[PDB]
């Protein structure tokens, strides 16, 4: 069991990520893959089970078992 | 069991992500894949089960088992 | 069992994501894939079951099992 | 069982996502895929069942099992 | 069972997403796919059943099992 | 003299001031003065003349010359 | 004289001041003065004349010349 | 004289001041003065004349000449 | 005289001042003066004249000439 | 005279001052003076005239000439 009393629990918390990103003449050319160019924020508590993937940012899988 | 009393629990919380992104003459050319260019925010608590994927941002899978 | 008393639980909460994105002469050319260029916000609690996918932003799958 | 008393639970909540997005001469040319360019907000509690997909924003699937 | 007493539960709630989006000379040319360019807001509680899809914004499926 | 040609002049312009102000149990007790608690927006071009006051927000004067 | 040609002049311009101000149990007690608690935005071009005051926010004067 | 050609002049410009100010149990007690507690934005170009005051935020004067 | 050609002049410009100010149990007690507790932004170009004051934030004067 | 050609002049410019100020149990007690506790940003170009004061933040004067 789990018991909290009068507590202030902050679990999986992302506070105030400030970004001032100035670019000029940007070019991106992806080809059949995965690209992430930006602010990201993932918060998780519990992930269970055989063969599990959690908060996969930019994941690429080619499986041929 | 789980018991809280008088608590302030903040689970899976994303607070105030501020972005000031100035670009000029941006170009993107994706070809048959996955691209993410932006502010993202995912909050999760519980994920269960065999073969599970949670909060997959930019995920690419080619499976031929 | 789960029991809360007098609590303030904030589960899976996305608060005030502020974006000031100024662009000029943007071009995007996707071809048969997945593209995300924008503010996103996903909040989830519980996902269950074998072979589950949760909050998939930009997901690409080609399965030929 | 689940029991709350005098609580203030905020589950799966997206509060006040403010966007000031100024563009000029934008062009988008999608071809047979999935594109998302905008503010999105998804809130979910419970998803159950084998082979489940939840809050899929930009999802692309080609399955030939 | 589930029992609430004197509570203020806010489940699956999207509050006040403000957008001031100024564009000039925008062009979009989709071809046989899925495009979303706008403010979206989806709120859900419960989704059940084998082979379920919930809050699918921009979903594309070609299945030939 | 003043001459404009083909111009886009934006003089004294206040664009899109967004406010999400959540309060709880506020109390104000003014006594014989000046109080401003709110969003304000004043735009002016030209003010002329001896002894002039322009866009006075919260002004208090007791003059006994 | 003043002459503009094909220009884009932005004079005295306040663009998109975003505020997310959350308070709880605020109290204010002014007594015979000047108080400003809020978002303010003043834009001015020209003020002329002996003894001039422009965009006075919170001004207090007691003159007994 | 003043002459602009094909220019982009941004004079007296305040762009996107973002504030996320969370307080709890604030108290203010002013007595016969000047108080400013908030976001302010003043833009001015030209102020002329003997004995001039411009963009006075929180000004207090007691003159007995 | 002043002449610009094809220029991009940014005079008196305040860009994107981001503040995430979290307080708890704040108290202020002013007595017959000047107090400023907040984000401020003043932009000015030209101020002229004998005995001039410009962008005075928190100014206090007692003159008895 | 002054002449610019094809230039990018940034005069009196304050760019992106980011502040994450967390306090707890703050107390301020001013008495008949001047106090500034906050983010400030002043931009000026030209100030002229005998007996001039520019961008005075926290100024206190008692003159009895």
XYZ file of C-alpha atoms in Angstrom:
650
model
C 0.000 0.000 0.000
C 0.865 3.687 -0.371
C -0.212 6.402 2.062
C 0.445 10.145 1.899
C -0.543 12.647 4.587
C -0.417 16.423 4.214
C 2.169 16.047 1.454
C 2.966 18.046 -1.691
C 4.159 15.437 -4.189
C 5.197 16.654 -7.655
C 5.717 13.504 -9.738
C 6.593 13.642 -13.426
C 6.426 17.429 -13.683
C 7.910 19.711 -16.344
C 7.838 23.360 -15.285
C 8.259 26.373 -17.543
C 10.702 25.472 -20.336
C 11.276 28.847 -22.012
C 12.734 28.997 -25.519
C 13.638 32.027 -27.626
C 14.868 30.399 -30.848
C 15.568 32.818 -33.703
C 16.553 31.242 -37.017
C 17.011 32.638 -40.512
C 16.812 30.670 -43.765
C 16.439 27.194 -42.285
C 16.098 24.160 -44.551
C 15.209 20.584 -43.613
C 14.986 17.637 -46.020
C 14.011 14.350 -44.383
C 13.835 11.107 -46.352
C 11.928 8.147 -44.939
C 12.938 8.458 -41.295
C 12.179 10.384 -38.108
C 13.049 14.015 -37.361
C 12.178 16.146 -34.331
C 13.065 19.855 -34.311
C 11.060 21.527 -31.559
C 10.260 21.843 -27.886
C 9.060 18.546 -26.412
C 7.733 17.674 -22.961
C 6.652 14.183 -21.863
C 5.556 13.251 -18.335
C 4.810 9.666 -17.307
C 4.249 7.663 -14.133
C 3.794 3.953 -14.764
C 4.456 1.667 -17.724
C 4.113 -2.095 -17.390
C 4.130 -5.173 -19.591
C 6.600 -7.316 -21.508
C 7.882 -5.549 -24.608
C 7.012 -1.988 -23.607
C 8.210 1.351 -24.975
C 7.632 4.616 -23.108
C 8.086 8.241 -24.188
C 9.886 7.346 -27.416
C 10.793 10.629 -29.145
C 12.534 9.986 -32.455
C 12.181 6.203 -32.347
C 12.913 4.133 -35.459
C 12.421 0.360 -35.557
C 12.755 -2.178 -38.358
C 12.202 -5.661 -36.923
C 12.058 -8.846 -39.012
C 12.232 -11.583 -36.387
C -4.456 0.159 -1.814
C -3.607 3.855 -2.125
C -4.700 6.526 0.350
C -4.058 10.274 0.247
C -5.061 12.728 2.973
C -4.951 16.510 2.659
C -2.359 16.190 -0.101
C -1.566 18.243 -3.213
C -0.357 15.679 -5.750
C 0.681 16.954 -9.194
C 1.218 13.841 -11.327
C 2.099 14.041 -15.009
C 1.915 17.831 -15.206
C 3.395 20.161 -17.829
C 3.305 23.793 -16.712
C 3.716 26.843 -18.922
C 6.168 25.997 -21.724
C 6.730 29.400 -23.344
C 8.193 29.613 -26.847
C 9.088 32.681 -28.903
C 10.329 31.109 -32.149
C 11.024 33.576 -34.964
C 12.021 32.057 -38.301
C 12.478 33.511 -41.772
C 12.294 31.594 -45.056
C 11.933 28.093 -43.633
C 11.609 25.094 -45.947
C 10.735 21.500 -45.068
C 10.528 18.590 -47.521
C 9.566 15.273 -45.939
C 9.407 12.061 -47.959
C 7.510 9.071 -46.597
C 8.514 9.329 -42.947
C 7.740 11.201 -39.731
C 8.593 14.823 -38.925
C 7.707 16.902 -35.863
C 8.578 20.613 -35.782
C 6.562 22.233 -33.008
C 5.754 22.487 -29.331
C 4.567 19.161 -27.911
C 3.237 18.229 -24.478
C 2.170 14.716 -23.437
C 1.072 13.723 -19.926
C 0.339 10.120 -18.957
C -0.218 8.063 -15.816
C -0.655 4.362 -16.507
C 0.022 2.126 -19.501
C -0.306 -1.642 -19.228
C -0.272 -4.684 -21.478
C 2.211 -6.786 -23.425
C 3.491 -4.964 -26.494
C 2.604 -1.423 -25.438
C 3.789 1.943 -26.750
C 3.193 5.175 -24.832
C 3.634 8.818 -25.854
C 5.443 7.983 -29.093
C 6.338 11.296 -30.768
C 8.088 10.715 -34.084
C 7.751 6.929 -34.038
C 8.498 4.911 -37.180
C 8.022 1.139 -37.338
C 8.371 -1.353 -40.179
C 7.832 -4.861 -38.802
C 7.705 -8.014 -40.941
C 7.886 -10.791 -38.359
C -8.890 0.303 -3.639
C -8.061 4.008 -3.887
C -9.174 6.632 -1.370
C -8.554 10.384 -1.411
C -9.577 12.788 1.353
C -9.487 16.575 1.103
C -6.887 16.315 -1.656
C -6.099 18.423 -4.732
C -4.869 15.909 -7.307
C -3.830 17.246 -10.728
C -3.271 14.172 -12.911
C -2.382 14.438 -16.586
C -2.587 18.230 -16.722
C -1.115 20.611 -19.302
C -1.226 24.223 -18.125
C -0.828 27.311 -20.283
C 1.635 26.526 -23.093
C 2.182 29.959 -24.656
C 3.651 30.237 -28.150
C 4.534 33.344 -30.153
C 5.792 31.833 -33.422
C 6.479 34.350 -36.194
C 7.493 32.893 -39.553
C 7.950 34.406 -42.999
C 7.783 32.542 -46.315
C 7.439 29.017 -44.950
C 7.137 26.055 -47.315
C 6.281 22.441 -46.497
C 6.097 19.571 -48.999
C 5.149 16.224 -47.475
C 5.013 13.045 -49.548
C 3.130 10.022 -48.240
C 4.124 10.224 -44.584
C 3.332 12.039 -41.338
C 4.162 15.652 -40.470
C 3.258 17.675 -37.376
C 4.108 21.389 -37.232
C 2.076 22.952 -34.437
C 1.259 23.141 -30.758
C 0.087 19.785 -29.397
C -1.246 18.788 -25.982
C -2.295 15.253 -25.003
C -3.396 14.196 -21.511
C -4.111 10.573 -20.603
C -4.665 8.462 -17.498
C -5.079 4.770 -18.251
C -4.381 2.588 -21.281
C -4.690 -1.186 -21.071
C -4.633 -4.190 -23.371
C -2.134 -6.246 -25.346
C -0.857 -4.366 -28.381
C -1.767 -0.849 -27.269
C -0.597 2.546 -28.522
C -1.216 5.742 -26.553
C -0.794 9.404 -27.513
C 1.028 8.632 -30.761
C 1.908 11.978 -32.379
C 3.669 11.462 -35.700
C 3.354 7.674 -35.717
C 4.118 5.712 -38.890
C 3.665 1.940 -39.112
C 4.034 -0.502 -41.993
C 3.512 -4.035 -40.675
C 3.408 -7.153 -42.867
C 3.598 -9.971 -40.331
C -13.310 0.576 -5.453
C -12.498 4.288 -5.643
C -13.627 6.870 -3.090
C -13.024 10.624 -3.072
C -14.062 12.982 -0.274
C -13.989 16.772 -0.468
C -11.384 16.565 -3.226
C -10.600 18.724 -6.268
C -9.354 16.253 -8.880
C -8.316 17.647 -12.278
C -7.739 14.608 -14.505
C -6.845 14.933 -18.176
C -7.067 18.726 -18.254
C -5.602 21.152 -20.795
C -5.732 24.745 -19.565
C -5.343 27.868 -21.676
C -2.872 27.136 -24.493
C -2.339 30.594 -26.003
C -0.865 30.931 -29.491
C 0.007 34.071 -31.446
C 1.277 32.616 -34.734
C 1.957 35.177 -37.467
C 2.983 33.775 -40.846
C 3.438 35.342 -44.268
C 3.286 33.528 -47.611
C 2.956 29.980 -46.301
C 2.671 27.053 -48.710
C 1.830 23.423 -47.948
C 1.663 20.591 -50.493
C 0.728 17.215 -49.020
C 0.610 14.068 -51.141
C -1.261 11.018 -49.882
C -0.275 11.170 -46.221
C -1.080 12.931 -42.951
C -0.268 16.535 -42.027
C -1.186 18.508 -38.905
C -0.353 22.222 -38.704
C -2.396 23.733 -35.888
C -3.222 23.864 -32.209
C -4.380 20.483 -30.900
C -5.714 19.429 -27.503
C -6.748 15.874 -26.578
C -7.850 14.760 -23.105
C -8.550 11.121 -22.252
C -9.099 8.960 -19.180
C -9.495 5.280 -19.989
C -8.783 3.146 -23.050
C -9.074 -0.632 -22.898
C -9.000 -3.601 -25.241
C -6.489 -5.615 -27.243
C -5.216 -3.685 -30.249
C -6.144 -0.188 -29.085
C -4.987 3.230 -30.285
C -5.623 6.392 -28.269
C -5.216 10.071 -29.173
C -3.385 9.357 -32.429
C -2.518 12.729 -33.995
C -0.750 12.271 -37.321
C -1.048 8.483 -37.395
C -0.269 6.573 -40.596
C -0.705 2.803 -40.876
C -0.319 0.405 -43.792
C -0.828 -3.149 -42.528
C -0.915 -6.234 -44.766
C -0.716 -9.090 -42.272
C -17.793 0.904 -7.282
C -16.994 4.621 -7.410
C -18.140 7.156 -4.817
C -17.551 10.912 -4.736
C -18.606 13.220 -1.903
C -18.547 17.014 -2.034
C -15.932 16.861 -4.789
C -15.149 19.072 -7.792
C -13.887 16.649 -10.441
C -12.844 18.102 -13.812
C -12.250 15.102 -16.088
C -11.348 15.492 -19.750
C -11.584 19.283 -19.767
C -10.120 21.757 -22.264
C -10.268 25.329 -20.975
C -9.885 28.487 -23.033
C -7.404 27.811 -25.855
C -6.880 31.295 -27.307
C -5.397 31.696 -30.784
C -4.533 34.871 -32.685
C -3.248 33.474 -35.993
C -2.569 36.082 -38.682
C -1.529 34.739 -42.080
C -1.070 36.364 -45.475
C -1.207 34.604 -48.848
C -1.528 31.035 -47.597
C -1.794 28.146 -50.055
C -2.623 24.502 -49.354
C -2.774 21.711 -51.946
C -3.700 18.309 -50.531
C -3.800 15.195 -52.704
C -5.663 12.117 -51.500
C -4.687 12.214 -47.835
C -5.508 13.918 -44.538
C -4.712 17.509 -43.553
C -5.646 19.426 -40.402
C -4.827 23.141 -40.137
C -6.884 24.597 -37.303
C -7.720 24.665 -33.624
C -8.869 21.259 -32.374
C -10.207 20.145 -28.999
C -11.232 16.571 -28.136
C -12.339 15.396 -24.683
C -13.027 11.740 -23.893
C -13.576 9.528 -20.858
C -13.956 5.859 -21.729
C -13.228 3.779 -24.823
C -13.505 -0.002 -24.733
C -13.413 -2.932 -27.125
C -10.889 -4.904 -29.151
C -9.615 -2.920 -32.121
C -10.559 0.554 -30.903
C -9.412 3.996 -32.044
C -10.066 7.122 -29.978
C -9.670 10.817 -30.821
C -7.827 10.162 -34.083
C -6.969 13.564 -35.591
C -5.190 13.167 -38.919
C -5.473 9.379 -39.056
C -4.678 7.525 -42.286
C -5.100 3.758 -42.629
C -4.697 1.411 -45.582
C -5.197 -2.167 -44.379
C -5.264 -5.215 -46.667
C -5.062 -8.109 -44.220
C 4.180 68.556 -45.229
C 3.872 64.776 -44.928
C 3.622 62.399 -47.885
C 3.236 58.615 -47.872
C 3.239 56.417 -50.976
C 2.298 52.740 -51.054
C 3.099 52.474 -47.348
C 1.686 50.375 -44.499
C 1.975 52.621 -41.441
C 0.773 51.221 -38.100
C 0.841 54.157 -35.670
C -0.366 53.844 -32.089
C -1.492 50.229 -32.415
C -2.151 47.676 -29.669
C -2.489 44.154 -31.058
C -3.986 41.163 -29.280
C -3.200 41.440 -25.554
C -4.351 38.052 -24.242
C -4.987 37.575 -20.525
C -6.009 34.440 -18.638
C -6.285 35.737 -15.062
C -7.723 33.254 -12.559
C -8.260 34.565 -9.034
C -9.998 33.141 -5.981
C -11.393 35.133 -3.052
C -10.154 38.570 -4.082
C -10.919 41.618 -1.940
C -10.362 45.290 -2.752
C -11.121 48.226 -0.442
C -10.342 51.633 -1.930
C -10.769 54.835 0.064
C -10.949 58.168 -1.740
C -8.307 57.564 -4.394
C -7.729 55.859 -7.742
C -7.444 52.117 -8.390
C -7.085 50.244 -11.683
C -7.178 46.433 -11.709
C -7.796 45.297 -15.274
C -6.637 45.152 -18.862
C -6.123 48.629 -20.323
C -5.247 49.770 -23.839
C -4.786 53.408 -24.894
C -3.665 54.548 -28.353
C -2.942 58.191 -29.170
C -1.319 60.233 -31.926
C -1.182 63.942 -31.160
C -1.643 66.018 -28.012
C -0.905 69.738 -28.011
C -1.330 72.734 -25.740
C 0.209 74.196 -22.599
C -0.727 72.197 -19.515
C -1.736 68.965 -21.244
C -2.203 65.447 -19.881
C -2.457 62.419 -22.169
C -3.457 58.811 -21.458
C -3.429 59.254 -17.681
C -4.312 55.870 -16.146
C -4.432 56.084 -12.360
C -3.815 59.828 -12.166
C -4.344 61.681 -8.882
C -3.949 65.454 -8.583
C -4.544 67.855 -5.706
C -3.475 71.346 -6.786
C -3.950 74.487 -4.679
C -1.837 77.055 -6.508
C 8.888 67.653 -44.482
C 8.561 63.879 -44.125
C 8.294 61.459 -47.046
C 7.889 57.678 -46.977
C 7.876 55.434 -50.047
C 6.916 51.762 -50.068
C 7.722 51.546 -46.361
C 6.302 49.496 -43.479
C 6.608 51.787 -40.455
C 5.405 50.443 -37.092
C 5.490 53.414 -34.705
C 4.288 53.160 -31.119
C 3.142 49.548 -31.389
C 2.475 47.039 -28.605
C 2.117 43.499 -29.940
C 0.609 40.540 -28.116
C 1.400 40.869 -24.395
C 0.235 37.507 -23.033
C -0.398 37.089 -19.307
C -1.432 33.986 -17.372
C -1.697 35.339 -13.815
C -3.143 32.901 -11.275
C -3.668 34.266 -7.768
C -5.408 32.897 -4.691
C -6.788 34.940 -1.790
C -5.535 38.354 -2.872
C -6.280 41.437 -0.776
C -5.707 45.095 -1.643
C -6.447 48.068 0.624
C -5.652 51.448 -0.916
C -6.060 54.683 1.032
C -6.227 57.989 -0.821
C -3.591 57.332 -3.470
C -3.027 55.574 -6.794
C -2.761 51.822 -7.386
C -2.417 49.899 -10.651
C -2.530 46.088 -10.620
C -3.159 44.902 -14.168
C -2.006 44.698 -17.755
C -1.478 48.150 -19.268
C -0.601 49.234 -22.801
C -0.123 52.854 -23.910
C 0.999 53.936 -27.389
C 1.738 57.563 -28.261
C 3.367 59.556 -31.049
C 3.524 63.275 -30.339
C 3.080 65.400 -27.222
C 3.835 69.115 -27.276
C 3.429 72.148 -25.050
C 4.981 73.648 -21.933
C 4.039 71.700 -18.819
C 3.012 68.448 -20.498
C 2.528 64.953 -19.082
C 2.256 61.892 -21.324
C 1.239 58.301 -20.559
C 1.275 58.799 -16.789
C 0.377 55.443 -15.202
C 0.263 55.713 -11.419
C 0.900 59.458 -11.282
C 0.386 61.360 -8.024
C 0.800 65.136 -7.782
C 0.222 67.583 -4.941
C 1.307 71.051 -6.073
C 0.852 74.226 -4.013
C 2.975 76.756 -5.884
C 13.528 66.640 -43.793
C 13.186 62.874 -43.371
C 12.901 60.405 -46.249
C 12.480 56.628 -46.114
C 12.450 54.332 -49.146
C 11.474 50.664 -49.103
C 12.288 50.508 -45.394
C 10.867 48.514 -42.473
C 11.191 50.854 -39.491
C 9.990 49.574 -36.102
C 10.095 52.584 -33.766
C 8.901 52.397 -30.173
C 7.739 48.784 -30.378
C 7.068 46.327 -27.550
C 6.692 42.765 -28.824
C 5.175 39.847 -26.945
C 5.978 40.235 -23.234
C 4.801 36.902 -21.810
C 4.177 36.549 -18.077
C 3.133 33.486 -16.086
C 2.884 34.899 -12.553
C 1.434 32.511 -9.967
C 0.924 33.938 -6.483
C -0.813 32.628 -3.379
C -2.178 34.727 -0.509
C -0.912 38.117 -1.653
C -1.639 41.238 0.392
C -1.051 44.878 -0.539
C -1.773 47.892 1.680
C -0.967 51.242 0.080
C -1.357 54.511 1.974
C -1.514 57.787 0.065
C 1.112 57.073 -2.579
C 1.660 55.256 -5.874
C 1.907 51.494 -6.402
C 2.235 49.513 -9.635
C 2.106 45.704 -9.540
C 1.462 44.461 -13.064
C 2.605 44.190 -16.651
C 3.144 47.614 -18.223
C 4.016 48.635 -21.777
C 4.507 52.232 -22.949
C 5.624 53.250 -26.447
C 6.377 56.858 -27.383
C 8.008 58.797 -30.210
C 8.183 62.526 -29.562
C 7.755 64.706 -26.482
C 8.527 68.417 -26.602
C 8.139 71.488 -24.426
C 9.706 73.034 -21.339
C 8.764 71.143 -18.190
C 7.718 67.868 -19.811
C 7.223 64.400 -18.333
C 6.931 61.302 -20.523
C 5.902 57.729 -19.694
C 5.949 58.292 -15.932
C 5.041 54.967 -14.287
C 4.939 55.302 -10.509
C 5.593 59.045 -10.437
C 5.094 61.006 -7.211
C 5.525 64.783 -7.035
C 4.965 67.280 -4.233
C 6.062 70.724 -5.429
C 5.625 73.936 -3.421
C 7.755 76.424 -5.340
C 18.157 65.670 -43.055
C 17.801 61.913 -42.579
C 17.501 59.404 -45.422
C 17.066 55.632 -45.232
C 17.021 53.293 -48.232
C 16.031 49.630 -48.134
C 16.852 49.524 -44.425
C 15.430 47.577 -41.473
C 15.767 49.957 -38.526
C 14.568 48.729 -35.116
C 14.688 51.772 -32.823
C 13.500 51.641 -29.226
C 12.325 48.031 -29.378
C 11.649 45.616 -26.514
C 11.257 42.039 -27.737
C 9.734 39.152 -25.814
C 10.545 39.591 -22.109
C 9.358 36.282 -20.637
C 8.739 35.986 -16.897
C 7.688 32.955 -14.861
C 7.451 34.419 -11.347
C 5.997 32.074 -8.726
C 5.499 33.552 -5.261
C 3.761 32.294 -2.135
C 2.411 34.437 0.706
C 3.688 37.807 -0.488
C 2.977 40.959 1.514
C 3.576 44.584 0.530
C 2.870 47.631 2.707
C 3.686 50.955 1.059
C 3.312 54.252 2.906
C 3.164 57.501 0.951
C 5.782 56.739 -1.687
C 6.318 54.874 -4.957
C 6.549 51.103 -5.432
C 6.863 49.076 -8.638
C 6.720 45.269 -8.488
C 6.064 43.978 -11.992
C 7.199 43.653 -15.577
C 7.748 47.052 -17.199
C 8.618 48.017 -20.769
C 9.120 51.597 -21.993
C 10.234 52.561 -25.507
C 10.999 56.152 -26.496
C 12.633 58.044 -29.353
C 12.822 61.781 -28.759
C 12.409 64.006 -25.708
C 13.195 67.712 -25.883
C 12.823 70.816 -23.750
C 14.401 72.399 -20.688
C 13.458 70.557 -17.511
C 12.397 67.263 -19.083
C 11.891 63.818 -17.556
C 11.583 60.691 -19.700
C 10.541 57.134 -18.818
C 10.598 57.750 -15.066
C 9.680 54.452 -13.371
C 9.587 54.841 -9.599
C 10.255 58.583 -9.582
C 9.771 60.591 -6.382
C 10.217 64.368 -6.261
C 9.671 66.907 -3.493
C 10.779 70.330 -4.740
C 10.359 73.571 -2.778
C 12.494 76.024 -4.736
C 22.807 64.681 -42.314
C 22.439 60.932 -41.782
C 22.125 58.384 -44.586
C 21.678 54.615 -44.341
C 21.619 52.233 -47.305
C 20.617 48.575 -47.152
C 21.445 48.519 -43.444
C 20.021 46.621 -40.462
C 20.373 49.044 -37.550
C 19.177 47.871 -34.120
C 19.312 50.946 -31.873
C 18.131 50.871 -28.271
C 16.943 47.263 -28.368
C 16.265 44.892 -25.468
C 15.859 41.299 -26.638
C 14.329 38.446 -24.670
C 15.149 38.936 -20.973
C 13.955 35.653 -19.450
C 13.342 35.414 -15.706
C 12.286 32.416 -13.624
C 12.060 33.933 -10.131
C 10.603 31.631 -7.472
C 10.117 33.161 -4.028
C 8.382 31.954 -0.881
C 7.045 34.144 1.931
C 8.330 37.491 0.685
C 7.634 40.676 2.642
C 8.244 44.282 1.604
C 7.552 47.364 3.738
C 8.375 50.661 2.039
C 8.016 53.986 3.839
C 7.875 57.206 1.837
C 10.485 56.397 -0.796
C 11.008 54.482 -4.038
C 11.226 50.704 -4.458
C 11.526 48.629 -7.634
C 11.370 44.826 -7.428
C 10.705 43.486 -10.914
C 11.831 43.105 -14.495
C 12.388 46.477 -16.168
C 13.254 47.387 -19.752
C 13.766 50.946 -21.030
C 14.876 51.855 -24.560
C 15.650 55.430 -25.602
C 17.284 57.274 -28.489
C 17.488 61.020 -27.951
C 17.088 63.290 -24.933
C 17.886 66.990 -25.162
C 17.529 70.126 -23.076
C 19.118 71.749 -20.040
C 18.175 69.957 -16.834
C 17.101 66.643 -18.356
C 16.586 63.223 -16.778
C 16.263 60.065 -18.875
C 15.212 56.526 -17.939
C 15.278 57.195 -14.196
C 14.353 53.927 -12.452
C 14.268 54.372 -8.685
C 14.948 58.110 -8.723
C 14.477 60.167 -5.553
C 14.936 63.943 -5.489
C 14.404 66.525 -2.758
C 15.522 69.925 -4.056
C 15.115 73.196 -2.140
C 17.256 75.613 -4.138
